Amino acid sequence: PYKYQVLAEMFRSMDTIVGMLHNRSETPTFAKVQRGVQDMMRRRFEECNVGQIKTVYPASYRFRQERSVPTFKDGTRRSDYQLTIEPLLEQEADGAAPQLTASRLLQRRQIFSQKLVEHVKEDIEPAALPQPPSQDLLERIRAKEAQKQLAQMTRCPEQEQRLQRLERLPELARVLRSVFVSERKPALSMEVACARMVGSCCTIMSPGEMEKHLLLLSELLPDWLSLHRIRTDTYVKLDKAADLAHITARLAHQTRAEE
Amino acid sequence: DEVAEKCQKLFLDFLEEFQGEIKYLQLAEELIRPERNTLVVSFVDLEQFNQQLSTTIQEEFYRVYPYLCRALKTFVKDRFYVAFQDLPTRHKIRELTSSRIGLLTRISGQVVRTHPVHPELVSGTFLCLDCQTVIRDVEQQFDTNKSRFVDFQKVRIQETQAELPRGSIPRSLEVILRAEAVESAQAGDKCDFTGTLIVVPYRLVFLACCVAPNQMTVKEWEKVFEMSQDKNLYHNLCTSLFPTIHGNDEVKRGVLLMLFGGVPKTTGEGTSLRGDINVCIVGDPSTAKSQFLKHVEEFSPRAVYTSGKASSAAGLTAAVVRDEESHEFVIEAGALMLADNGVCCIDEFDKMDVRDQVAIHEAMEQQTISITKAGVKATLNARTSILAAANPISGHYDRSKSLKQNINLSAPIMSRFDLFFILVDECNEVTDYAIARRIVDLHSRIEESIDRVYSLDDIRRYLLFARQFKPKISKESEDFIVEQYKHLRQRSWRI
Amino acid sequence: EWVSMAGPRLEIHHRFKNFLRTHVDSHGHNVFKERISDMCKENRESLVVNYEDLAAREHVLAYFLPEAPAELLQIFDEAALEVVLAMYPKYDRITNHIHVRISHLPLVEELRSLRQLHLNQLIRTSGVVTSCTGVLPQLSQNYQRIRIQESPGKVAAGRLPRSKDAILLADLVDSCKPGDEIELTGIYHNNYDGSLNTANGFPVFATVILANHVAKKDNKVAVGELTDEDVKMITSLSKDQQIGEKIFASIAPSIYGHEDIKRGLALALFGGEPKNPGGKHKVRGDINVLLCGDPGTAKSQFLKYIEKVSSRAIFTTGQGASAVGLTAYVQRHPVSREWTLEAGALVLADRGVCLIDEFDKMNDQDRTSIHEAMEQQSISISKAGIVTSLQARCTVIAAANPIGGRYDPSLTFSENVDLTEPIISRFDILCVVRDTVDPVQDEMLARFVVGSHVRHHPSNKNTYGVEPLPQEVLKKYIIYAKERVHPKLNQMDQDKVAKMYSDLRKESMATTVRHIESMIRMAEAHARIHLRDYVIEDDVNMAIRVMLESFIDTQKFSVMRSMRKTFARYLS
Ligand SMILES: Nc1ncnc2c1ncn2[C@@H]1O[C@H](COP(=O)(O)OP(=O)(O)OP(O)(O)=S)[C@@H](O)[C@H]1O
Ligand SMILES: Nc1ncnc2c1ncn2[C@@H]1O[C@H](COP(=O)(O)OP(=O)(O)OP(O)(O)=S)[C@@H](O)[C@H]1O
Ligand SMILES: [Mg+2]
Ligand SMILES: [Mg+2]
C-alpha cells in the first residue's frame, strides 16, 4: 500500500540516519533524526510513525529516556528529558563493535518489507513509546492566657538559645574538623578559624555567635578540643584521630540530656 | 610511587564497596557512552568511607590523580576522567600561596573572560625520520591519527567584590578546563572551581575539574514559619530595617517593596516584561538620603555603590579594550552588568552628564545593554534595579517656581522611575526635638538604643524564601486594578 | 589505511571512471557528459559531481569519501583528468589539472559544533564571510585566505559570534566576497603553530577548514527547504479575500491599536522589486520607515518584535553605533599584517533588515556615511590604498524621539525632528504617533493590557475582527512571497497619477519623483502580498491612500483640514 510504502521509505531513512550517528560515537537523539529525515524526504516526521515502526518490527531499536545529553549552546536545561534510540545489532564473533554496514542496512529494509507483506497478507496502531519519568469576656480570657504564657516565659531565654545551638553543633564540628585537616596546623587562632568557618558554613552567622559556639564545644567536649591562652589570644587545638561517628553519637546524647 | 599504588587499590575499594545500593555503578555504566567520559565523586563519601585515603588524596592530588584514572579505567573495563565535588572548605584568591601547591582546594571567583576551545595532545605517536620507528604513548611536558587529543578551554577569572580589600586591585587568575569542563562556564558568571594550583613555566595557573554556581534545619524553618504568620510583619520589618532613622517611613516601605520585587514575564512574542522596580529620591540636603544607600548596601550582599560624576559611560555599562596578548578587541565589564540580579545605587545622579544618562536609558527599560563598537557586536544582560539619589536644581526647593521647573530631569528619565519621592524640609519644633534626641541618644548610647524585632540574617533568610514564589492575580484584583487606574489616569509626571 | 592498498585503490579508480561514463539520469541523459562539454566550452578547471547520485549508485564510495577524503579526492581528480584526455585530448593544452568538487553533503554542521572528532574529515558548514585576503602564488598556485563568522540571525542573544579560517585553491579562489552568506564543504584539518603553543603553554593546533565547494546561500536553498504542505497552506491563504486583514491583525498581538504603523511596517517588510533600468541607473526596491512618536507608545516593543520575526535582523542602539561600527573599515591583520576589511552592521544587514533605535541621537558625522547606503544600497570604501564596493541592499527602520519629549502639532514635521531634509527625503513612509487622553481608549488599553498580563503568566503557560495567523505560518508566507512573486505594472492609468502629482506640487509649494517611486514600489509590495503576478489598481488605490495619510500627518494643523477637504475623494 501507499502508506506502507511511505513507512518503508522513512524506515530506510531512519536506519541510514541512525547508522550515520552511531558510527562516529555519537548518541542518536530524536531531534537530529527528525531533522535528517525531514531534509532527506521533505516530509513531516513525528513520534506516531516511530511507534508504528515499533509495532511493525520492534527488534530494530531500543528506545530509552535519558538525561545529561549535551546539546551544545542551545540553551537546553538539564532537566529536559530526551528520547534516545539505540540500534539492536547482533554481536559479531570477531570481537569488534557492531557497525551498520550496507549489508546489514539491506537486510533490515528487506526484513521490514517482509513484515509489511505479512501484515498485508493478514492503519497500523502505533506502539507505546517509553514516556519520560461578650467581647469583654473574650478579651479577659485572652489576657489571662497572655499572662499565663508570660509567666511561662519568665524562664531565662538563654536556656532555649543553647538548645537552639545544640542542633547546629554537629555540622559545625564536621566543618571544623575539615578546616583543621586542610590547614596542616596543630593550632589556629580564633580569628582565622572563625572567619574560615563563616566563609564555609551553610548559614550566615556573626563572629560572636561562632565564638560562643566554640566555647560551648570546648566546655561540653574537653577531651577532643582544647583551648590555650597565649599572651593576648586563645588558640584552638584538636585531636584529628577521634572517630567522627562516635563524637556525633556523644553530641546527640548530650543534646537529648539537655532536652 | 608505592603510595600511589596503595591509593589506586583504595580507590578501587571505594568504587567497589561504597553504598544499600552502590551509587557509582550506574555512573560507571554511563561512562561507556562516548559523550560521557568524566566521573563525579563526592568528597564527603570519600572521607566517611576512610580517612587515610581522603587525607592522602587531599594532600597528594596531583601525585595520585593519574592512578585514580587508571583505577577508574580498570573498574569500567571489568564490566576516562575523575571529578570531585562537595569539598567543605572555601578559600580566597589572596590565600593562594606556594605552600598549597598540589593540594585539592576549591576557589570562588567571577568569570570575566573566556577563550575558545583548543585541542590538547596528551599522548603522541611519533615517527622517526631516520629509521622509520614508531614511538607511541609519548607524554607531553606542556602521527596525529594515532595520538590522543583532549579538549581545552582557557578561563580568566577576577576576584569577587566582597572579598576585595579596600584599596586593592582585584588580581586575576587563569583557569584550565578539559573534557566535560569545557564550555561549562560563561563570561560574567560567579563560579567555584575545584582543583589544584600548578606551576607553569615561573607562572601561577590553577587547574580545575568541576564548576559550581526542604533541607533547612527544623528550628530555622519553624522560625520562618512563625514569623510568616505575624499580622504586623510589615510594620515590624519597616521598623527593624531602619532602627536608627527617624520618620520618613514611606521611603522605607518603597525600598522594602523594591527589595521584594515583582515577577518578570516573557510573552509568546519573545518580549520580556520587567519584574523589577526603579526608585528615585529627590530632597533637600537636610533629609537623609545617602544613609538609605549605605543601609541597603551593607544589608544586601548583592549591592553596588558608585558616585555620580566620577563614573563615565564606559565604566557603567561596558568598555571595548584591545587585549595586549591576543592583539584583538575584548569587552571589560561595567558596574551595571556586575550588579546583575541585584541592586545598583547611584549618588548625586544630577551631576552626571546627559551623555551618561543616554547610555543608562537602554538598561533602564530594556534591561539589556548592546555594544556595536569597532567591529564588536554583542548584547549583554543588565537585570538590575536602580536606586537613584539627587537634589533639586537649587539647594533649596523654591516654592516660587512650579514643580516641573524645580527638577532638571529629562521626560523619559522621569517616566522610567516607578516610585518618585520628593522631600521638603520644614521648621517644626517637635520634629527638631525628636531628631535631636535620636541623634544624641545614638551618639551616647550606641548599642543599647537599638531594638530590632527581627535579626538581619532572619530577614535575609525570609527574603530568600519569599522571592521564589510567583503569586497569581485574581479577577477581583483584576477589575479593582482596572477601576483604580481609570480613576488615577483621569487626573509634569504624566501617568 | 585500507584504502591505501593498491588493489582496492586502482579498482575504485576504474569504478569511478565507469560511474562517470555510465550513470543515467531520470530523463535518460548522461549528465556528466553534458557537464564536461560545458566545462570544456567554458575552459574551467573544476568539475561538480552530486553526492546524492554517488550515494544512490555506489554506497561504498559514499562511505569512503568522509573517511579518506584526501587520497580518494586525488584519485578522482586523476580519473577525471584521464577521462578528459581520452574524450578531449586537446584539453591538456588549456588545462593541466582538473579538480572534482563535491556538492550537497547531507551532514551540515555549525562552527560551534566543531570538535576534535571532525578533524581531517569532510564537513559542510554555513556562515558569513567577514574578511578576505588577495590572490597569492605558490611554488607548487592560487591562494585565498578568508575569515568566516557565524550568521548573526542564527546566533543566540548574549553570546559573541565565533570566527574561523578557510583556504581556497585555484578555481575556488575569488569565488566569494566579504559579507556574502555562503555554505561550504571542506576538510576540517589541523595546523601546527608554535606561537600558540608558546602563548598558551601547551600544544595547541589551529584548526582550519580547506573548502572543496563554495555555494553562496541565496534563498533558493530556502525555497527548496519549503514543504509542499507549506506551499499549499500559503496558496490557500492567498485565495482568501480577507488575507490582508488577517495579515495586518497578525502583527503585534500584544500591542493594541495603531493600525497605520503596523500597516506601514508590514508593507515595508514585504518590500518592492529593485530595478536597474539599462544598467545606467538602479532603482531601489526598498522602503525606508521613520517612526517619531510621543513616549509611552511602545516603539521599542515594535522594533523588538520586528527583530524577532525577521529571518535576518540586526539591532543597534543610537549611543553604541559609531560610523566605523556601522560601516566596513580597513584594518591591519594582527598576525599577517595586510590590510583587511571587517564588515559593519549594514553590510551584515544585506538582503536583511537593519533596525536603528534613537536615530535622533546620531552624530552628524556618522549621518554623512548613511546617505550613500540609503540612496544607492551600496558602499564604496576607499581607505589605505584599497578601493572596494560592497552591496547594502537592506530595509532600514529608524526610531526617533521629538526634541523636548513632546510633538508640537503647531509646527512642521521637519522642525520637530533634529534631522536634515535629505535624510527625511530618503525615508519613504513617515508615521507620527501622539498621546491623547480619551477615556474610552484608556478603557480599551487597560482591558487589553490586563488581559495580556493574565494570559502570559509563566504559571498559566481585534479592530478588523480577524483571527491572527501563526508566527511560523506568517514567516513561511513571507519567505515564499519574497522568493516567488514579481509583479508587473502593465495596467496603470498615468493620467490619474499625473493629476495627483500636479496637485501634490501645488499643495506643497503652497506650504518629488522619489515619492512616485516609493508609491510604485509600495504598490508592487502590496501586489506581492496577494501573490499576484500582475498589479491590480486596488493596490495603487491603497498605496495612494496610505501615502496621502502619511503626508498630511506631517503638516501643520491650520492646513491639514483643508488638505483633507481637498483630498476627501481618495481618503473616502
Ligand atoms: N531622619 C533622620 N534620622 C536620623 N538622622 C538623620 C535623619 N535625617 C537626617 N539625619 C542626619 O543627617 C545626615 C545627612 O544624611 P545624608 O543622607 O548624607 O544627607 P543627604 O540628603 O544625602 O545630603 P547629600 O546628598 O549627601 S549633600 C545623616 O547622616 C544623619 O546624621
Ligand atoms: N499601546 C500599548 N499597548 C500595550 N502595552 C503598551 C502600550 N504602550 C506601552 N506599553 C507598555 O509600556 C512599556 C514601556 O513602553 P516603552 O516602550 O518604554 O515606551 P516608548 O514609547 O518606547 O518610549 P521610550 O523609547 O521608552 S522613551 C512597554 O514595554 C509595554 O509593555
Ligand atoms: Mg547624600
Ligand atoms: Mg522605546
Name the DSSP letter for residue C365: H
Q: What angle do helix axes B249-260 and B233-241 make, rounded to 10 degrees?
A: 100
DSSP secondary structure, A139-205, as one string = HHHHHHHHHHHHHHTTS-THHHHHHHHHHHHHHHHHHHHHHHHHHT-SEEEHHHHHHHHHHH-SS--
Ligand 3 midpoint to CA B168 (Å): 25
Residue A180 one-letter amino acid = F
Distance from CA of B47 to the nearest CA of C (A): 34
Distance from the Cα of residue A250 to its chain's centroid: 32
> C370 and C423 in contact (C-beta within 8 Å)?
yes
- HSE-CB for B73 with a 13 A CA cutoff: 8
> C458 and B473 in contact (C-beta within 8 Å)?
no
- Contact of B33 with chain C, judged by CB distance below 8 Å, is answered with no
C-alpha cell, A17: 540516519
C153-181 burial code (b ≥16 CB/10 A, e <16)? eebeeeebbbebebbbbebbbebbbbbbb
> C4 and C71 in contact (C-beta within 8 Å)?
yes
CA distances (Å), C458 to each of B269, B471, B472, C33, C266, in order? 14, 11, 10, 62, 30
C-alpha cell, C58: 555506489
Name the DSSP letter for residue C257: S
CA–CA separation, C326 and C392 (whole Å): 11
Q: For residue B58, which of B89, B94, B21 has the smallest C-alpha distance?
A: B89
DSSP 3-state helix, strand, coil percentages of chain A (rounded to 5)? 60, 10, 30
- Residue in B244, B280, B291 to alter for ligand 1 test, most ligand atoms within 8 A of Cβ: B291
To one decimal place, what's the resolution in Å? 4.1
List the residue whose alpha carbon is closest to atom 24 of ligand 2: C295
Q: Do B358 and C318 touch (CB under 8 A)?
A: yes
Beta strand A225-230 with A233-238: parallel, antiparallel or unpaired?
A: antiparallel
- Residue in C254, C294, C300, C358 to alter for ligand 2 test, most ligand atoms within 8 A of Cβ: C300
> B19 and B49 in contact (C-beta within 8 Å)?
no
φ and ψ at residue C328, rounded to 5 degrees = -80, 145
Instruction: List residues near ligand 1 (CB under 6 A).
Output: B 245-248, 283, 285, 287-291, 391, 435, 438-439
Which chains lie within 8 Å of chain C at 3 or more CB pairs, if any?
A: A, B
List the residue whose alpha carbon is closest to atom 2 of ligand 2: C255
Breaks (C-N over 2.5 A) in chain B follow: 19, 79, 142, 201, 213, 491
Does residue C192 sit in helix, strand or coil? strand
Q: Do C446 and B142 touch (CB under 8 A)?
A: no
Mutate to test the interface with A, among C63, C114, C120 (most CBs of A within 10 A): C63
Q: For residue A4, which of A61, A45, A53, A63 has the smallest C-alpha distance?
A: A53
CA–CA separation, C366 and C347 (whole Å): 16
For residue B361, the ligand closest to its alpha carbon is 2
CA–CA separation, C450 and B217 (whole Å): 41
- Contact of A121 with chain C, judged by CB distance below 8 Å, is answered with no
- Contact of A202 with chain B, judged by CB distance below 8 Å, is answered with no
Q: Enumerate residues 6+ apart whose C-beta is below 8 A from C3.
A: C9, C12, C64, C67, C68, C71, C72
- Contact of C406 with chain B, judged by CB distance below 8 Å, is answered with yes
Name the DSSP letter for residue C459: T
CA–CA separation, B370 and C320 (whole Å): 7
C418-453 burial code (b ≥16 CB/10 A, e <16)? ebeeebeebbbbbbbbeeeeeeeeeeeebeebbebb
Separate counts of helices (H) and strands (E) for chain C: 23, 17
Q: Do C443 and B365 touch (CB under 8 A)?
A: no
Q: For residue B320, which of B306, B310, B334, B309 has the smallest C-alpha distance?
A: B334
CA–CA separation, B93 and B173 (whole Å): 8
CA–CA separation, B365 and A68 (whole Å): 36
> C373 and C328 in contact (C-beta within 8 Å)?
no
> B196 and B105 in contact (C-beta within 8 Å)?
yes
Residues 469-508 of C with CB under 8 A from B: 471
Q: Do C112 and A72 touch (CB under 8 A)?
A: yes
Q: Is the dihedral of CA C353, C359, C361, C362 positive or negative?
A: positive
- HSE-CB for C89 with a 13 A CA cutoff: 0
CA–CA separation, C128 and C144 (whole Å): 16
Q: Is the dihedral of CA C249, C254, C256, C259 positive or negative?
A: negative
φ and ψ at residue B337, rounded to 5 degrees = -75, -20
- Contact of B220 with chain A, judged by CB distance below 8 Å, is answered with yes
Instruction: List residues near ligand 2 (CB under 6 A).
Output: B 365, 412; C 255-256, 295-301, 445, 449
Separate counts of helices (H) and strands (E) for chain A: 9, 5
Residues of B within 8 A of A169 (CB-CB) are none
Residues 68-107 of A with CB under 8 A from C: 72-73, 75, 102
3-state SS, one letter per residue, for chain B: CHHHHHHHHHHHHHHHHCCCCCCHHHHHHHCCCCCCCEEEEEHHHHHHHCHHHHHHHHHCHHHHHHHHHHHHHHHHHCCCEEEEECCCCEECHHHCCHHHCCCCEEEEEEEEEECCCEEEEEEEEEECCCCCCEEEEEECCCCCCCCEEEEEEEEEEECCCCCCCCCCCCCEEEEEEEHHHCCCCCCCCEEEEEEEEEEECCEEEEEEEEEECCCCCHHHHHHHHHHHCCCCHHHHHHHHHCCCCCCCHHHHHHHHHHHHCCCCEECCCCCEECCCCCEEEEECCCCCCHHHHHHHHHHCCCEEEEECCCCCHHHHCEEEEEECCCCEEEEEECHHHHCCCEEEEEECCCCCCHHHHHHHHHHHHCCEEEEEECCEEEEEECCEEEEEEECCCCCCCCCCCCHHHHCCCCHHHHHCCCEEEEECCCCCHHHHHHHHHHHHHHHHCCCCCCCCCCCHHHHHHHHHHHHCCCCCCCHHHHHHHHHHHHHHHCCCCCC
Ligand 2 midpoint to CA C210 (Å): 49
Q: Enumerate residues 6+ apart whose C-beta is below 8 A from C562.
A: none
Residues 179-198 of B with CB under 8 A from C: none
Residue C507 one-letter amino acid = E
CA distances (Å), B69 to each of B8, B32, B37, B198, C54, in order? 9, 14, 11, 19, 45
CA–CA separation, A12 and A7 (whole Å): 9
Other beta carbons within 10 Å of C57: 13
Q: What angle do helix axes B290-299 and B249-260 make, rounded to 10 degrees?
A: 40
CA–CA separation, B356 and B127 (whole Å): 62
C-alpha cell, B296: 541597603
CA distances (Å), B446 to each of A202, B237, B296, B441, C237, in order? 30, 21, 20, 7, 77
Mutate to test the interface with C, among A34, A72, A73 (most CBs of C within 10 A): A73
Within C151-225, strands assigned E span 163-169, 181-192, 205-216
C-alpha cell, B76: 569500567
> C119 and B118 in contact (C-beta within 8 Å)?
no
DSSP secondary structure, A37-84, as one string = HHHHHSS---HHHHHHHHHH-GGGEEEEEE-----SSS---TT--EEE
Burial classification of residue A50, based on how many CB atoms lie within 10 Å of its CB (0-12 exposed, 13-18 middle, 19 or more buried): buried
Ligand 2 midpoint to CA C110 (Å): 37
φ and ψ at residue B264, rounded to 5 degrees = -85, 145
For residue C441, the ligand closest to its alpha carbon is 2
List the residue whose alpha carbon is closest to atom 3 of ligand 2: C255
Distance from CA of A78 to the nearest CA of B (A): 12
CA–CA separation, C15 and C42 (whole Å): 27
CA–CA separation, B55 and A31 (whole Å): 46
> C207 and C190 in contact (C-beta within 8 Å)?
yes
Name the DSSP letter for residue C112: G
Residues 97-136 of C with CB under 8 A from B: 115-116, 119-120
> C358 and C399 in contact (C-beta within 8 Å)?
yes
- Nearest Cβ partner for A167 among B48, B88, B217: B217
> B265 and B407 in contact (C-beta within 8 Å)?
no
Q: Do B34 and A25 touch (CB under 8 A)?
A: yes
Residues 332-351 of C with CB under 8 A from B: 334-335, 342, 344-345
Burial classification of residue C558, based on how many CB atoms lie within 10 Å of its CB (0-12 exposed, 13-18 middle, 19 or more buried): exposed
Residue with cell 501617568: B495
Q: Do A175 and B220 touch (CB under 8 A)?
A: no
CA–CA separation, B278 and B289 (whole Å): 16
Other beta carbons within 10 Å of A26: 13
Beta strand C289-293 with C395-400: parallel, antiparallel or unpaired?
A: parallel
Q: Is the dihedral of CA B340, B342, B346, B347 positive or negative?
A: negative
Q: For residue C497, which of C485, C478, C515 has the smallest C-alpha distance?
A: C515
Q: For residue C442, which of B399, B490, A257 has the smallest C-alpha distance?
A: B490
Q: Enumerate residues 6+ apart whose C-beta is below 8 A from B186.
A: B111, B114
CA distances (Å), B228 to each of A161, B233, B234, B242, in order? 21, 7, 10, 20
DSSP secondary structure, C345-363, as one string = HHHHTTTSEEEES-GGG--
Q: Do A164 and B58 touch (CB under 8 A)?
A: no
Q: What angle do CA A98, A104, A105 make, to 5 degrees?
A: 120
C-alpha cell, C229: 504542505
- HSE-CB for B493 with a 13 A CA cutoff: 18
List the residue whose alpha carbon is closest to atom 8 of ligand 1: B288
Q: Do C60 and A102 touch (CB under 8 A)?
A: yes
Q: Which residues pair with C316 in a beta bridge?
A: C356
Q: Which residues pair with A189 in a beta bridge?
A: A235
Other beta carbons within 10 Å of B129: 7
> B262 and B277 in contact (C-beta within 8 Å)?
yes
Torsion, Cα of B399, B401, B404, B407 (10° steps): -70
Residue A111 one-letter amino acid = I
- Residue in B266, B271, B358, B365 to alter for ligand 2 test, most ligand atoms within 8 A of Cβ: B365
Burial classification of residue B481, based on how many CB atoms lie within 10 Å of its CB (0-12 exposed, 13-18 middle, 19 or more buried): middle
Beta strand C378-383 with C163-169: parallel, antiparallel or unpaired?
A: unpaired
C460-495 burial code (b ≥16 CB/10 A, e <16)? eeeeeebebbeeeebebbbbbbbeebebeeeeeeee
CA distances (Å), C350 to each of C340, C392, C397, C517, in order? 20, 5, 14, 21
- HSE-CB for A229 with a 13 A CA cutoff: 2
Distance from CA of A41 to the nearest CA of B (A): 29
CA–CA separation, C54 and B254 (whole Å): 72
Sequence-distant contacts of B71-75: CB under 8 A, at least 24 apart: B71/B8, B71/B9, B71/B11, B71/B12, B71/B15, B72/B11, B72/B15, B72/B28, B72/B31, B72/B39, B74/B12, B75/B12, B75/B15, B75/B16, B75/B28
Q: Enumerate residues 6+ apart whose C-beta is below 8 A from B359.
A: B313, B316, B317, C319
Residue B43 one-letter amino acid = F
